[PDB]
Amino acid sequence: KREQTIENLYQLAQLTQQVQADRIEIVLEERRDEHFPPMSKALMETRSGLTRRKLDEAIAKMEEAGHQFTKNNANHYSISLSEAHMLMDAAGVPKFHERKKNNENKPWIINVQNQKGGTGKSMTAVHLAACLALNLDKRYRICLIDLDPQGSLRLFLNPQLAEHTNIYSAVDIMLDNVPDGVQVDTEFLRKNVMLPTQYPNLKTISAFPEDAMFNAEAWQYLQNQSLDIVRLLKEKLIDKIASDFDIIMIDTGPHVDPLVWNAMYASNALLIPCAAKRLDWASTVNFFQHLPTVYEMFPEDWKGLEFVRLMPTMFEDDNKKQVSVLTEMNYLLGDQVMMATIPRSRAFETCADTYSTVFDLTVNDFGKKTLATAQDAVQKSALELERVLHSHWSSLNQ
Amino acid sequence: KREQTIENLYQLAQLTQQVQADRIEIVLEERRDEHFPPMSKALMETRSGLTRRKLDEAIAKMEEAGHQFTKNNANHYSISLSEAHMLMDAAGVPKFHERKKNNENKPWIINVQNQKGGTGKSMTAVHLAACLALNLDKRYRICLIDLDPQGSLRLFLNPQISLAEHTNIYSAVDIMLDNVPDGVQVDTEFLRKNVMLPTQYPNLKTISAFPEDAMFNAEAWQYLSQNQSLDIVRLLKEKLIDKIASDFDIIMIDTGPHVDPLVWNAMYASNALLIPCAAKRLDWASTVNFFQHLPTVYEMFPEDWKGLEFVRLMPTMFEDDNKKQVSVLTEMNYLLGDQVMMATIPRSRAFETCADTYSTVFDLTVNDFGGKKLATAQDAVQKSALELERVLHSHWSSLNQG
């Protein structure tokens, strides 16, 4: 009877093989067509350590080259992000990475990981990446790798004609899922992987559900006792891209797989976001218990993890239970927990509903101050993270 | 170098070993907080298949006894769910297993599975379970096993209704890994009192899931590497399903978006396969890749495996007026017809309200909006459930022998 069933499933596979997924078509149907909110002169001045005189001089220098800015009959300006990066390049700012002693720097590889789903992990990741990409004084080179096959990071930072076609994911690069005749060159990685977003300096390596096969073709393969699978992501992707980025951030998902193991091995920093709820905190501490027993099995040439941080998410701040849970986090493993939380606001629910960040939204989408406070909270969290990255940076170069 | 990091991690885990997870406290904080919407003679007839005369005679018999019914603002009676279950055995119609026409049935082990998340398989599972439980005439003994560590099937107003006098509450993964007190043995009574919990549907029991269960995969990752045995797929069927089949007509396993050794357990234990897939394009393509991968996995299973008996693709979130989605649905029906189910599930706002309120379309009323939309949604769910029931009654005697 087993024969009949296996025959029937093989028949289903043969009947349905004819349909394949066109990734370009999927990305095209998921086009952004929303136009990132343009910045006024003051918003430009706050996102970029620039005085009004320097900004006016930059506008003059760029206008002398023919480029025409967008202002209204009362000289209110609507500066796009591209114009904002050009104003920095046209202002003489050394643009962090091009200046001294930081010119020779080992890039940060941050792994956002937790065993519980429904804690703002995937959302904290995109918000952190965007908010760091909005520091126009430094203009960090940021890469966001969606390592969750069920991830939607390709929808929040939508990648981009029909002559730079066929986009491969991280897993695809791990399995050499490429034309048999192509090289693993960095220009290839720059061209049809690591696609640009509505932010000029922030690239995303998108994920697709078909990536899940990696685990299936590795769970059965684990009969071979390899325990070298963890080297795949770092040896096949990161080392080929680390020359181009200052910060790489990896969004994994709520599980423990060979893929999440790759994310752990390639990482040199670990970020653990967890909601201030009792169930989420208990699952996170079970994750804590589990983490070292697996990290030991990693090969000796690991030497990873410069620092580890717990990021409280969805903090209600009026709920006695949630504040008590946060105080427990602070008492048990303090200073390893972050001092900047991310609140529960209707703003982030709107973000999830519209597949965008609070920085892609406008004040007229719902709630006036309720968006300003959300953006300021995300900025405080990103600033604390930046302070931690700068503190532990020289220790990362060796 | 990394020695200091691993010592730091061990100190992180030691600093926090004190905080445990009280799975009784969290199910009590998740109490139902409301009752099932009572039925008013009409729903009773439609669900029970009873004539108005027989129903009235039975309720008048029950009223002359110590029991008294209850009406609403209008004198029409407003009977609850358990009151209707009592009406059933107090009307003459036996339970499904009580009917001597089939008393040695191998129960259905239906496995809902697809390596694409967000295609609405969990909602399909909970609604199928609730609707089949609402067949008051036959009163199937149904068990909904949440095998998704991130599953919330206990939440969907399927509350593990249990008085505060019950010691613990274990998941299916806990029973598989023998994660119970040391002295006790896993008998049908232990599973009955600590594993399968009441749901507010008298004929439906639920096995809960918790995020900690995720670590099962680790318990296999080192098993599969240092040992090429593949005997972990037997854990679900042998440690739980076999010791539990004596109490259920139907068992539905909700799995999760992955293909894992836990999903392997769900596949090995199943005798029926449901593949819900949304009418979206990339959903259909990922389900097709899943199809391509499936037989190469099932072929690795041990030689003691009595097949699958049937497979059904369940379209979900169908938008009815979307040209791309209707094209995809017609492609699904054309390529593997007779194996794709006819009744689909719309993209109704009623299911959005369900996901917002953690309920089923049979639990909430018209006031939660709409109105006609909920009626059409629950009618569609009932139609799909009747189709699956007709399929089950067909292929049943095929596996009653094996």
Ligand SMILES: Nc1ncnc2c1ncn2[C@@H]1O[C@H](COP(=O)(O)OP(=O)(O)O)[C@@H](O)[C@H]1O
């Ligand atoms: N800061 C926040 N405030 C309010 N709601 C949030 C916040 N972050 C996340 N959410 C909600 O919780 C859900 C968690 O999303 P996600 O981060 O993808 O979870 P996970 O990372 O566990 O998959 C989202 O759908 C969103 O609606």
Ligand SMILES: Nc1ncnc2c1ncn2[C@@H]1O[C@H](COP(=O)(O)OP(=O)(O)O)[C@@H](O)[C@H]1O
């Ligand atoms: N018919 C429907 N109409 C509207 N929304 C739906 C419908 N069916 C499912 N959904 C939405 O899709 C989501 C699917 O959730 P879930 O079933 O847990 O994912 P998975 O299918 O991966 O298990 C739900 O949150 C629900 O809000």
Ligand SMILES: [Mg+2]
């Ligand atoms: Mg996520």
Ligand SMILES: [Mg+2]
């Ligand atoms: Mg699910």
